[PDB]
Design a protein around this ligand. Structure first.
Ligand SMILES: Nc1ncnc2c1ncn2[C@@H]1O[C@H](COP(=O)(O)OP(=O)(O)OP(=O)(O)O)[C@@H](O)[C@H]1O
Ligand SMILES: Nc1ncnc2c1ncn2[C@@H]1O[C@H](COP(=O)(O)OP(=O)(O)OP(=O)(O)O)[C@@H](O)[C@H]1O
Ligand SMILES: [Mg+2]
Ligand SMILES: [Mg+2]
Lengths: 393, 146, 390, 152, 836, 51
């Protein structure tokens, strides 16, 4: 509460013990003094009737205006509801830390002096963008990533959890992370897991949502997305499917390509530009990283680049177990037979296999899923391959 | 130019242009307010705006020739202390494909080069260095040309 | 418990907990309950309970914002336009002198006779007033390694003419008023911009190109005009257009309208930079990655006189960058930054900073408190080599 | 629907506030609650993708244009609450109305009712239905050919 | 569990509980070596408890047993080492230290920092618990500490090394291995820890830091530490030992700034110039050079500061009739403050007699002294201008001229002793007004000098019969200023005798409050050495006894940050009129560490909220002392609240405290607030007088002077400045009778604290040398890795800059290397040989 | 008037000179949802929706 800034070594040290012991001693003195003085005289009546004078000063029918500009000398230009603007005086009982252009102020009825400020709604974009606890699951579900989980933790979680490690070495944490891999490997899953396991305001936006239909709205959306990310203390901004907005940036293009490029430039500036970015961490996922902009994924912009490979032999078993955990199975399931094939199977493919097997068991009315059911579901899932056989091979 | 397109926004500027056309020439002739207009492009201007009753005298401003370049450099070097050695004819010959702005840049860059060197008066070498700076030519890391 | 962070860790934790508890007790004892009406703490209902709010509401009347339109005759007679209320022909108050009021400025007027009482600052877009820097970055030219000639040119464009004006008037030189910075990503353009902002003793206005793009027709031009008017207000003021390629695309109007609004914004910017009216003491930076896309009118001298090229550093510059970025790090006594600079082929200061941070994090991973030359080598292998495909 | 950040409103448009509240209720109410939701749409593409998410209405059933039997059944359903005379062969009406959809089958009933009204009888006739189909199907074909000409 | 092959291979040793016990030698060395390698091997996570340790945790009793008393050659040693490292997790007794003492003797770097830190903590604990009787058992601990310390120094844990050595109290060991790179960090950490430690250890810490600084030949830093320690023999030793004349000149500048004079032997090199720098003879010349450089030479009349035309002239006609004489006195004070130290003035210089006779009674005395205030530091030119008024038909004017001469000589030292020569005549004169002027002039001229001749001249005045209480108190004040920080037996005996000689009725006078102030100023800064004075004073009447006790105690513990003393003062506050002195003394004690200063701000706020009029009339004067010349917005708001207050005394003290807080800052916000307050108290004479004084203080000098006692990075304290501040504030304690009365010349005590804010950099031959510097708010860099920046929010100017409170300066280019690291005041700069 | 009756979105009457809530005027709830229940939906069955 506006307490002294220790600014001692800032690492556990005897100097930091001494500065802290001193604060405790002074606080003990103040507490004893206030307690004894309250016992001697309550002063509750004195504290009251000052509020009565304040209420007298601010009449009964307080009007709601809109602060427009502070002349910085306890004066302001405030706009009434009709639209008129008045040059009034900011009285002394109004908490001036709340005043900012556009705030909803309370104005005196006769003299229009600023006599208070009203709280404002809490959804610029926060309710739309924030994900709350990720409905999917905690870190338990993710299977076989391990090293990628460790990298993500070292990027986003560790700075908030143990910052002393960074402050000791004097290095600032890595700026951002980009998750790249073939479609269906777990980028969004890991992002959601860290979102639900973290203590910071987590925001998610899909790149297709930044392709607005009106000029300048994509840039405005990115500007406001990063605007309500410093307003919410520590935050993590996860721009899923960046490939939609970021691209090689070929100059010779016409149409909405120019607007997409301008949106990308605004995002670039937000990631690293003239101003300091405060305390905000950026995660990005992209099935296709080779088509991105070198300026967009340059080191100072995105430090860490995590690769998500297709599950090979045992990660596959782990996902199968995880997705069949809450599902009764007959004692004839050859999950090893299912996974043994080198079919480039993805985790999303495994999830679809499990869901379809359960669905067809339900269709047949059975009470347990069978190995033949799993095999037929897998065959149906792998039926969605397409392409040409001889071509390319 | 006016075109039949479904995109809005251009129609508002077209309406402003129509008002400007009427003001220039139309009902209620005007004989007390003249007009001067400058354009980098004339291929996009509407025919009704390039008419003979609205913009009668269309004056072309070509890129300067050698003599024009020499005169521009002299004009912008009037106020500076320039030595009596500078061959403005040589500078004009060496500054082909320049405009008046680029010649002004040549002169100011020569002055700044002199200031960097710590010289009271300019010189032909300073002018050539300024020409090189204004040309904005980049090197290809090798010069295998004979 | 934990593995042991420090012999004093438990004492620090206990003292912090006691401080928090004592703060809670003091707050409870003194009251200070939050108010939904925006009331300051009772200890700062100060002169507000009375004794200055009373003496501010009694003598200080309420003035109403208006905009002067015309001044009639030598004798004071002013036409004003009270917003959304009315228009009047009004006289001055005895406090305000006639010279203070000009045509077009905002003036407060009393509610009884509507006479002017105080001039007011011009109305400015919030989105253009927030471009002003206010608080300047802490970077300096010493933090930019590998760029000597570039920084010299940038200074003599933006810094020296402001710092030592007489040096140029004496020799009759009109120094260049604009500079363009271009090069590969991560070379230091925005870093040099921050250095200029820090060093300058004048207005620094930061403009990002994407901001000038607006939904409604004729908005980017209005923002540019307001920005340049605010700049002219100041005695001398620097404007920095980062990512100017967003709105500086080459004019290519043909058939169906394409980027016509952005082209109009660009044309307004060009007109302000150089046109009929004389530009004030306004020096203009511009940083971009693709100078090719810029239009000839904008790249013409008189708007962008100097064109500084930023390139990948040499071995010496790389050594200097390594030293700069390892300055505030916990490193061993003797690390061959020359060896590291050689071991990293052509690479940017961003890459070098990433290498330093990754070395620090390898140390933190191995649970060490001192980054080693081996850590720096591993960082180079991770950044320069493994991510070489990017 | 359509999208939650579509016109740059930041989700503050009323159309998107309604979607937000619908999604909130849908997430709030549990699966084992005997409260099912059926949403229909003639334009699947423009439908908001936030409704088809797992944990929400994800299953989807398609509807081709009705065949002969479906057309006859829809005609019966929409002609149930109308005074029809003896020996009304809605099957022959369906046959005389080939390649018609729900809107056309709905409109033919009202047109037959109006024709019976003009003749001033309280019952619809087979001839009335024949004339009704001749009118509605012909006007639909006229609209189709007008659209074709506009495309031309 | 997934990778429990680690568990299996750990069992390969765990189940083989006696694998080393088995007679086969294949399992003796290799098995324990593999276990040691595994436990010492690091991980890829910073989470907790490396896997080998988490796995060998349960196998503790058997690990002990395998050690027991087996062969002592190598098996017992290695077993003891592994036991020790494992003992970290169990966290019971000191088994780690026990087994390290009896175990393998390897290098701790091989075991890592997380273990060295645990062993260091255990060593500190065992050393603390162990009594001195067991000396021979300390030797192993001493060698362990010797091993630990260089490891921390090399691995950048200087704070840890200093902490361990301070805990075991063997801080003198540092100098033997401090090395030339970590010396700066170690010295900074020790000097920072000095403040928050008790008396028996603060001096030891300072002496160790001085030892390191002398070892590495950082003579200016060594002299700073010596001045802080108050060891004049050390100061002389350092100054004489320094064999570089330029460095000796820099140290002479620091000594002159601090008010410390060294009587140098005539044989010393460049002796006369080193004694001219210490005497501040050139200070006026440098100040005028700075004034000309900055172009602020034009005199400012009080009307320029007042700016009446801006205010809404609602009563421009028959307005409130204020005391014209009082307002003229306010104008004279404002003119003096605004034109202080410049030498030119547009009121007294052009025609001084008219302005002087415009005033009334004592106002003439104050106005005449204002001339000396203006001519400050110009002894040579002071007399040629004050002579006209030295022979006047008005005793008030002559006394004012005497005080003006004293003021002019204040802060500078000549061999001509003009102050003594002129003011020794009127010390015992029969006119009490002239006595007052001469006594105060001599005190201000020789404050902090400890001149025996002046003291013996002054002392009889206190006991002289025909001396009013005013003259007695003023003589006590002058003696205290002359002997500040000297514990003079003569002064203390005289003051005690004078206090005892008077009656209760005479001691009820407020002017008598200046005697305990004199004693406190004499004993300023000497804590625990005032028990004798308190015992002596215990025999005086109750009210004045309590007042004097509190005042002497607070003055003695001034600038110490003694939490116990602050606690006692708060008890006193929570009766008589000693509560105000208690409130003032709280700030007097907490005036040092920033932590204490801000916590005292909180306490003062609570005091104003809950308190009696006596306490409330003193809180504002405590705020000014705690933050003098530091215009903090919170403090200014607090003072503005009580400027508009029902209690007139609180209002007056709040206005003056606002002026003091803004002293020498030209703060636009403060000027606007003071103009608003003039409008508010347009019709209140006393409040308007206070407002005018506050405006003058705010514009003290022209932004070129400060009243802050501290200097040299806010670490050194100016005894003379604190004496002047205490003079003025303790006088204000009863503002109605002293300041708004017949004795307002006391305001000139601020001349003691008046010092410049400049930063003038000279060449090696004492000649101006402009250089580019970066001026910005200081940043604390203690215990931070690398060489972090030392300033924030900085801008570039040319050498002659004015430094506001909390502003550090750092040379922009490496062209010049400063002699002293503290860029402040006068700094000699040398060319850097390796510039390019 | 008790505040508990001053619910969000309720019409109130404020006096003339000083706006002072002194009544809770009747409100039009306008329930538009109690008019689309079709009960068991009789005569809507698979047999007659054949196809
Ligand atoms: N290793 C895994 N463990 C558990 N589930 C997985 C794994 N890999 C993929 N999945 C499943 O894949 C489903 C698809 O979402 P996921 O986060 O995996 O996609 P993605 O890798 O981000 O794909 P895209 O690149 O198309 O966005 C998730 O619901 C998750 O159930
Ligand atoms: N010469 C240099 N010296 C020190 N640091 C540098 C240098 N060049 C680049 N950097 C580092 O690069 C980081 C990236 O910012 P920089 O100004 O270099 O980007 P940029 O070239 O403007 O990028 P963009 O092309 O994306 O606009 C800076 O924070 C700085 O740390
Ligand atoms: Mg995804
Ligand atoms: Mg940039």
């Amino acid at each position: 509460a506006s307490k002294l800034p220790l600014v001692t070594p800032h690492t556990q040290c005897r100097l930091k013990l001494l500065k802290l012991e001193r604060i405790k001693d002074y606080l003990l003195m103040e507490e004893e003094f206030i307690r004894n003085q309250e016992q001697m005289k309550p002063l509750e009546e004195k504290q009251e009737e000052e509020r009565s004078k304040v209420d007298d000063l601010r009449g009964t029918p307080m009007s709601v205006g809109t602060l427009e500009e502070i002349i910085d000398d306890n004066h302001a230009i405030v706009s009434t509801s009709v639209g008129s603007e008045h040059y009034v005086s900011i009285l002394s009982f109004v908490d001036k830390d709340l005043l900012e252009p556009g705030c909803s102020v309370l104005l005196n009825h006769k003299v229009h002096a600023v006599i208070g400020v009203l709280m404002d709604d809490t959804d610029p974009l926060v309710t739309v963008m924030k994900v709350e606890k990720a409905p999917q699951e905690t870190y338990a579900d993710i299977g076989g990533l391990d090293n990628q989980i460790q990298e993500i933790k070292e990027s986003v979680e560790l700075p908030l959890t143990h910052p002393e490690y960074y402050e000791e070495m004097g290095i600032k944490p890595p700026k951002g992370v980009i998750l790249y891999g073939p479609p269906g490997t777990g980028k969004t899953l890991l992002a959601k897991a860290v979102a639900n396991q973290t203590s910071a305001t987590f925001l998610r936006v899909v790149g297709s949502e930044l392709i607005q239909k009106y000029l300048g709205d994509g840039p405005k959306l990115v500007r406001e997305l990063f605007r309500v990310a410093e307003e919410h203390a520590p935050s993590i901004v996860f721009i899923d499917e960046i490939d939609a907005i970021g691209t090689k940036r070929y100059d010779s293009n016409s149409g909405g390509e120019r607007e997409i490029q301008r949106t990308m430039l605004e995002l670039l500036n937000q990631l690293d530009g003239f101003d300091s970015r405060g305390d905000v961490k950026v995660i990005m996922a992209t099935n296709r990283i080779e088509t991105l902009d070198p300026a967009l994924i340059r080191p100072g912009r995105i430090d860490r680049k995590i690769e998500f490979p297709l599950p090979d032999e045992k990660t596959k078993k782990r996902i199968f177990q995880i997705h069949t955990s809450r599902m009764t199975l007959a004692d004839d399931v050859t999950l090893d037979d299912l996974i043994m094939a080198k079919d480039d199977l993805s985790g999303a493919d495994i999830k679809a296999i499990c869901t379809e097997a359960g669905l067809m068991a339900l269709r047949e009315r059975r009470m347990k899923v069978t190995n033949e059911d799993f095999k037929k579901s897998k065959e149906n899932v792998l039926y969605k391959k397409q392409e040409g056989t001889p071509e390319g091979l | 130019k006016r075109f039949d397109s479904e995109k809005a926004g251009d129609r508002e500027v077209q309406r402003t242009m129509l008002e400007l056309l009427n003001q220039l020439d139309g009902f209620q002739p005007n004989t007390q307010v003249k007009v001067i207009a400058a354009t980098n492009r004339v291929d996009i201007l509407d025919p009704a705006l390039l008419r003979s009753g609205r913009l009668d005298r269309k004056i072309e401003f070509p890129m300067p020739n050698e003599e024009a370049r020499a005169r521009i450099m002299q004009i912008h070097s009037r106020k500076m202390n320039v030595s009596p050695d500078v061959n403005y004819e040589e500078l004009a010959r060496c500054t082909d494909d320049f405009n008046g702005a680029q010649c002004k840049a040549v002169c100011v860059e020569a002055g700044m080069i002199a200031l960097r060197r710590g010289a009271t008066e300019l010189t032909h070498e300073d002018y050539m260095e300024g020409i090189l700076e204004v040309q904005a030519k980049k090197k290809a890391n090798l010069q295998y040309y004979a | 418990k934990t593995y042991g962070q420090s012999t004093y860790s438990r004492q620090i934790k206990q003292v912090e907990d006691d401080i928090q508890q004592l703060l809670k007790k003091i707050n409870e004892l003194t009251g200070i309950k939050e108010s939904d009406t925006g009331l300051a703490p009772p200890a700062l209902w100060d002169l507000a309970a009375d004794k200055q709010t009373l003496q501010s509401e009694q003598p200080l009347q309420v003035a109403r914002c208006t905009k002067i339109i015309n001044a009639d005759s030598e004798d004071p007679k002013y036409i004003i336009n009270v917003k959304q209320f009315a228009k009047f022909v009004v006289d001055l108050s005895d406090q305000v002198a006639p010279t203070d009021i000009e045509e077009g400025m905002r003036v407060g007027v009393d509610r009884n006779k509507y006479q002017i009482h105080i001039p007011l600052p011009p109305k400015i877009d919030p989105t253009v007033t927030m471009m002003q820097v206010e608080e300047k970055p802490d970077v300096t030219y010493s933090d930019v390694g590998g760029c000597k000639e570039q920084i010299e040119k940038l200074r003599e464009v933006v810094e020296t003419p402001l710092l030592h004006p007489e040096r140029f008037v004496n020799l009759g030189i009109e120094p260049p008023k604009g500079v363009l910075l271009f090069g590969p990503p991560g070379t230091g353009k925005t870093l040099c911009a921050r250095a200029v902002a820090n060093r300058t003793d004048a207005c620094f206005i930061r403009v990002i190109g994407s901001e000038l793009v607006q939904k409604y027709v004729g908005e980017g031009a209005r923002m540019v005009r307001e920005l340049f008017e605010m700049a002219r207000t100041k005695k001398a003021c620097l404007i920095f257009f980062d990512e100017i390629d967003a709105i500086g695309g080459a004019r290519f109007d043909d058939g169906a309208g394409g980027d016509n609004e952005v082209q109009r914004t660009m044309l307004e910017l060009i007109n302000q930079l150089d046109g009929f009216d004389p530009r004030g003491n306004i020096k203009v930076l511009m940083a971009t990655n693709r100078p090719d896309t810029l239009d000839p009118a904008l790249m013409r001298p008189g708007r962008l006189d100097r064109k500084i090229e930023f390139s990948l550093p040499d071995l010496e510059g790389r050594t200097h960058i390594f030293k700069i970025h390892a300055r505030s790090m916990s490193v061993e006594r003797d690390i061959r930054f020359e060896l590291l600079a050689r071991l990293c082929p052509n690479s940017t200061g961003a890459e070098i900073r990433s290498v330093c941070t990754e070395a620090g994090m390898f140390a933190i991973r191995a649970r060490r408190k001192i980054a080693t030359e081996k850590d720096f080598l591993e960082a180079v292998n991770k950044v320069i080599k493994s991510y070489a495909k990017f | 629907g359509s999208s939650r950040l579509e016109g740059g409103s930041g989700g503050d448009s009323e159309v998107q506030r309604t979607m937000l509240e619908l999604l909130n209720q849908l997430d709030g109410f549990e699966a084992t609650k005997n409260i099912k939701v059926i949403m229909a749409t003639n334009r699947i593409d423009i439908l908001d993708s936030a409704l088809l998410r797992p944990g929400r209405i994800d299953r989807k059933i398609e509807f081709p244009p009705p065949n002969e039997e479906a057309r006859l059944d829809i005609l019966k359903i929409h002609s149930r609450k109308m005074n029809l005379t003896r020996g009304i062969n809605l099957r022959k009406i369906a046959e005389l109305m080939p390649g018609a959809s729900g809107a056309e089958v709905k409109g033919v009933c009202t047109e037959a009712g109006m024709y019976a009204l003009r003749e001033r009888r309280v019952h619809v006739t087979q001839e009335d239905f024949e004339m009704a189909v001749a009118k509605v199907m012909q006007k639909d074909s006229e609209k189709n050919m007008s659209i074709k000409k506009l495309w031309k | 569990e997934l990778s429990e092959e680690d568990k299996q291979l750990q069992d390969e040793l765990e189940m083989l509980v006696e694998r080393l016990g088995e007679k086969d030698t294949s399992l003796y060395r290799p098995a324990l070596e593999e276990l040691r390698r595994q436990i010492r091997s690091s991980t890829t996570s910073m989470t907790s408890v490396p896997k080998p340790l988490k796995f060998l945790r349960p196998h503790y009793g058997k690990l002990k047993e395998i050690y027991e008393n087996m062969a002592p050659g190598e098996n017992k040693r290695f077993a003891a080492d592994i036991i020790s490292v494992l003992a970290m997790t169990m966290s019971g007794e000191r088994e780690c230290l026990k087994y390290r003492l009896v175990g393998s003797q390897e290098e701790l770097a091989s075991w890592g920092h997380e273990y060295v830190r645990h062993l260091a903590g255990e060593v500190a604990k065992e050393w603390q618990e162990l009594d001195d009787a067991e000396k021979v058992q300390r030797e192993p601990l001493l060698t362990l500490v010797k091993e630990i310390v260089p490891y921390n120094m090399a691995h950048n844990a200087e704070h840890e090394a200093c902490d361990l050595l301070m805990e075991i109290e063997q801080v003198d060991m540092l100098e033997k291995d401090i090395d030339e790179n970590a010396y700066a960090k170690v010295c900074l950490y020790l000097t920072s820890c000095v403040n928050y430690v008790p008396e028996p250890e603060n001096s030891a810490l300072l002496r160790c830091a001085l030892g390191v600084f002398r070892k590495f030949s950082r003579f200016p830093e060594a002299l700073r530490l010596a001045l802080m320690l108050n060891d004049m023999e050390l100061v002389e030793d350092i100054f004489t030992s320094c064999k570089d004349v330029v460095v000796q000149k820099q140290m002479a500048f620091m000594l002159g700034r601090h008010g410390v004079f060294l009587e140098l032997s005539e044989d010393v090199e460049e002796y006369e110039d080193l004694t001219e720098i210490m005497s501040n003879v050139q200070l006026n010349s440098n100040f005028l050079a700075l004034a000309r450089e900055l172009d602020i030479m034009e005199p400012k009349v009080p009307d320029d500061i007042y700016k009446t035309h801006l205010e809404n002239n609602r009563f421009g006609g028959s307005g409130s009739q204020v005391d014209s004489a009082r307002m003229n006195l306010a104008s004279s004070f404002v003119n003096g403050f605004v034109n202080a130290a410049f030498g030119q003035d547009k009121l007294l210089t052009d025609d001084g007699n008219k302005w002087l006779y415009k005033n009334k009674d004592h106002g003439m005395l104050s106005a005449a002294a204002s001339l000396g205030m203006i001519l400050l530091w110009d002894v040579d030119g002071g007399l040629t201008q004050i002579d006209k008024y030295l022979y006047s038909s008005e005793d008030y004017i002559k006394s004012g001229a005497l005080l003006a001469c004293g003021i002019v000589n204040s802060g500078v030292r000549n061999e001509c002793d003009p102050a003594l020569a002129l003011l020794s005549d009127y010390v015992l004169h029969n006119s009490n007004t002239m006595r007052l002027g001469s006594i105060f002039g001599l005190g201000l001229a020789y404050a902090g000098s400890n001149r025996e001749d002046v003291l013996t001249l002054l002392l009889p005045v206190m006991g002289d019969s025909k001396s009013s209480m005013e003259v007695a108190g003023v003589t006590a004040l002058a003696c205290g200023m002359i002997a500040v920080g000297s514990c003079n037996g003569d002064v203390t005996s005289t003051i005690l005798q004078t206090i005892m000689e008077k009656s209760e009725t005479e001691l009820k006078d407020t002017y008598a409050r200046w005697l305990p102030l004199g004693l406190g100023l004499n004993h300023l800064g000497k804590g625990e050495a005032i028990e004798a004075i308190l015992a002596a004073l215990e025999v005086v009447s109750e009210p004045f006894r309590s007042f004097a006790n509190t005042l002497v105690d607070v003055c003695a513990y001034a600038g110490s940050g003694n939490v116990l003393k602050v606690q006692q003062l708060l008890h006193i506050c929570s009766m008589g009129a000693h509560q105000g002195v208690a409130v003032l003394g709280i700030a007097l004690i907490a005036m040092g560490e920033e932590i204490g200063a801000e916590m005292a701000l909180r306490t003062f706020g609570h005091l104003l909220r809950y308190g009696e009029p006596t306490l409330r009339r003193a809180v504002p004067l405590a705020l000014a002392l705690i933050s003098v010349s530091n215009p903090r917005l919170n403090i200014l708001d607090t003072l503005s609240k009580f400027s508009h207050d029902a209690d007139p005394e609180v209002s007056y003290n709040s206005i003056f405290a606002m002026g003091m807080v803004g002293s020498g800052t030209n703060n636009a916000r403060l000027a606007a607030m003071l103009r608003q307050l003039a409008q508010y108290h347009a019709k209140d004479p006393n409040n308007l007088f206070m407002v005018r004084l506050a405006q003058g203080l705010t514009h003290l000098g022209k932004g070129t002077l400060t009243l802050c006692p501290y200097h040299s990075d806010r670490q050194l304290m100016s005894q003379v400045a604190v004496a002047g501040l205490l003079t003025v504030l303790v006088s204000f304690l009863d503002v109605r009778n002293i300041i708004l009365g017949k004795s307002h010349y006391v305001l000139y005590g601020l001349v003691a604290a008046m010092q410049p804010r400049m930063l003038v950099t000279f060449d090696e031959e004492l000649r101006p040398l402009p250089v580019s510097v970066r001026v910005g708010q200081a940043v604390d860099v203690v215990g931070q890795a690398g060489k972090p920046k030392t300033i924030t929010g900085f801008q570039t100017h040319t050498t002659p800059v004015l430094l506001a409170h909390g502003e550090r300066a750092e040379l922009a280019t490496e062209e010049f290397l400063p002699v002293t690291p503290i860029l402040e005041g006068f700094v000699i700069l040398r060319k850097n040989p390796n510039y390019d | 008037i008790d505040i508990n009756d001053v619910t969000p979105n309720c019409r109130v009457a404020l006096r003339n000179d000083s706006y002072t809530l002194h009544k809770i005027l009747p409100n039009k709830v306008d329930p538009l949802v109690s008019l689309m229940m079709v009960e068991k939906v009789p005569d809507s069955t698979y047999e007659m929706i054949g196809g």
